[PDB]
Design a protein around this ligand. Structure first.
Ligand SMILES: O=P(O)(O)OC[C@H]1O[C@H](OP(=O)(O)OP(=O)(O)O)[C@H](O)[C@@H]1O
Ligand SMILES: O=P(O)(O)OC[C@H]1O[C@H](OP(=O)(O)OP(=O)(O)O)[C@H](O)[C@@H]1O
Ligand SMILES: Cc1ccc(C(=O)O)c(Nc2c(C)cccc2C(=O)O)c1
Ligand SMILES: Cc1ccc(C(=O)O)c(Nc2c(C)cccc2C(=O)O)c1
Ligand SMILES: [Mg+2]
Ligand SMILES: [Mg+2]
Ligand SMILES: [Mg+2]
Ligand SMILES: [Mg+2]
Lengths: 346, 346
């Protein structure tokens, strides 16, 4: 019979948990049954033990059990997510969010998991809010947005209200723990593909292992400059998840003709500033921010392509880049954002 | 400027803290300024990082700053403690408490730190209470007990009221942490000598290092059967603290003619049962319990002898054993307990 002392004792002994134990712990947390001290002890102990993919998968599994689901038959089998852990401490423009709009405009269904900033100036949700997008729609309306606009946004606190018990605790601790891996792993629409950012180089393989268990087609990405995105300032490490397997790759955008950017060229500001950057990119402005958006959009398109076993790496990237660039250039991305705004108002 | 994220982040990165950081943390805890989540995160993180003697010495130092002290010049320079961490999971008779009575009766001033049980059926304080000894005395009366009876008992919760802020958290976590090293290190009378039990074999050297920093004459002891006492069932490991230095020894009681015992023979019960066991030993009953009490009393006498650098190991033990046995056989130990009970009733 599981108990906090049994589980915390096992972790502080530097032992992997028995099957089901992480799930038991997470379920106690989600039902409001755990003391703040137990939540904090579990978060820290799991982090220092070094969590396994089995363990992180149990945590994410419990969250998804407690999440509001989308209605039956409303998420396309090939829907994709574009989201990261955050926590890279660099404060960039909102690359995942911009990429998502471009990806949707290219015709790939996007159901994005998102949230406000935890430490950056403006997170994906904050910037969407500044752009006039309704970020907090419930399951039925997200499904509708996806069908009618081509993109839906699942606001994490809206879909995971039981995770709130762990909220103050994680803020009070104030440093990242295993719980900081869970955002991209708990999209309530359960898309099977994704471009997934991870700020923590040494845990990205663990996140990839969780997606592999679900047989998702995902690229887990970590910029070698620290970004939880595909970067343009240097190479990125990619953990490619395909056919239940993980393959570690290094990716160099110079191989596709991208100029090296400086990190300050990608710097973000407050929500108004970041919204203006979105408008600039969608309006066709050339430069470092556009390049980074096109690259990340292409990455999500490659993840989507990977849902088929016949897809090949280089042609997939060349196609992703072509489609992402064209979605912007034709004005399809700009128009999709306007239509998304109108949807929320109507 | 120190903060919880700074300290917890350092610990979760498996780094030793900078000088003073552990003290800052402990002081935040003891002043009621730490959230339960922060207390728990710190306890767990310090435990898994592996605490250093510097760090543990800082925690104990902060406790001692906030403790009620005994009145000036009321504690002899050669006062001795006999106390352990507890947590050995064996539930023995109260060896330290019995040893302490015998040591005082031999004429060595004892100011003992004690507490009720945390995981056993009856702790030292519980058993003293059952015997009629007052465990509720404040500083002035403990000083008076020491002068008039030859022994004083500092009940830990009476002398460390500010430690209450961590009490609930430690119970909620329900497993040992670095905080479980602190009991024997925080006797408010600050004796310079002691026989100190440590249940946690891999941390006994750390406790010994804290005592070395203070230049105490201490034997930190761990029975190789797991006891936080000198055992009679097998060898014990001793970390001998003398002249600011620590030496690790293997100790075998057979060299002084002790019969090997079995742990079941040292087993305890509730407070009334354990009190009965004290009365039996003090009344001259021969057998395994007496042997273990005599062995531990002698160890405390050896630590006391060590306060002079001219003391020698094997003769110290022989003298300690002689004095401990005589203290029981003459009835001195029994009479002291009677006198101690009487003192409390006034
Ligand atoms: O404040 P931080 O912890 O650094 O997090 C930065 C943002 O990154 C994550 O989202 P996402 O990848 O969707 O946002 P993006 O569009 O900014 O990349 C997270 O939900 C935040 O919105
Ligand atoms: O419940 P546990 O965590 O196992 O602890 C048992 C006892 O050991 C410690 O005291 P001490 O060494 O003074 O007690 P003793 O006389 O029983 O040895 C502790 O303060 C408890 O009183
Ligand atoms: C989409 C996303 C991204 C990161 C995080 C993170 O805290 O690391 C995140 N966390 C939350 C989730 C998964 C659900 C509900 C609330 C939150 C939150 O921390 O606010 C949600
Ligand atoms: C004497 C002694 C022994 C062990 C412990 C321990 O918690 O492991 C201990 N703990 C306490 C101290 C040092 C002061 C005040 C209260 C306690 C307690 O845990 O109840 C006190
Ligand atoms: Mg992102
Ligand atoms: Mg990012
Ligand atoms: Mg003891
Ligand atoms: Mg003991």
């Amino acid at each position: 019979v599981p108990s906090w002392p049994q589980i915390l004792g096992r972790l502080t002994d530097n032992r992997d948990l028995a099957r089901g134990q992480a799930a038991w712990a997470m379920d106690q947390i989600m039902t409001g049954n755990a003391r703040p001290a137990q939540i904090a002890a579990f978060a820290v102990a799991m982090t220092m033990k070094a969590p396994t993919a089995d363990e992180v998968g149990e945590l994410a599994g419990v969250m998804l059990s407690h999440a509001h689901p989308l209605p039956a038959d409303t998420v396309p089998d090939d829907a994709v997510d574009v989201v990261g852990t955050g926590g890279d401490g660099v404060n960039t423009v909102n690359l995942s969010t911009m990429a998502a709009i471009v990806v949707a405009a290219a015709g790939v269904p996007v159901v994005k998991h998102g949230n406000r900033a935890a430490s950056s100036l403006s997170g994906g949700a904050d910037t969407l809010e500044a752009l006039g997008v309704r970020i907090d729609l419930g399951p039925d309306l997200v499904a509708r947005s996806l069908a009618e606009v081509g993109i839906g946004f699942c606001f994490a606190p809206r879909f995971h209200p039981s995770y709130r018990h762990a909220a103050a605790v994680r803020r009070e601790i104030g440093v990242p723990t295993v719980f900081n891996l869970l955002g991209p792993l708990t999209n309530p629409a359960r898309p099977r593909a994704g471009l997934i950012g991870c700020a923590f180089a040494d845990l990205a393989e663990v996140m990839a292992g969780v997606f592999a268990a679900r047989r998702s087609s995902v690229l887990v990405v970590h910029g070698d400059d620290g970004l939880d995105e595909l970067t343009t300032t240097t190479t990125s490490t990619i953990w490619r998840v395909a056919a239940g397997s993980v393959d570690k790759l290094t990716f160099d955008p110079a191989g596709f003709g991208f100029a090296r950017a400086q990190l300050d060229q990608l710097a973000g500001g407050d929500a108004q500033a970041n919204a203006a950057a979105v408008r600039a990119v969608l309006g066709g402005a050339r430069g470092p921010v556009r390049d980074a958006v096109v690259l990340n959009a292409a990455g999500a398109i490659v993840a989507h392509a990977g849902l088929s076993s016949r897809a090949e790496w280089l042609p997939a990237w060349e196609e992703g880049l072509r489609r992402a660039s064209a979605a912007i250039d034709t004005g399809a991305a700009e128009q999709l954002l306007a239509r998304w705004v109108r949807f929320g108002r109507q």
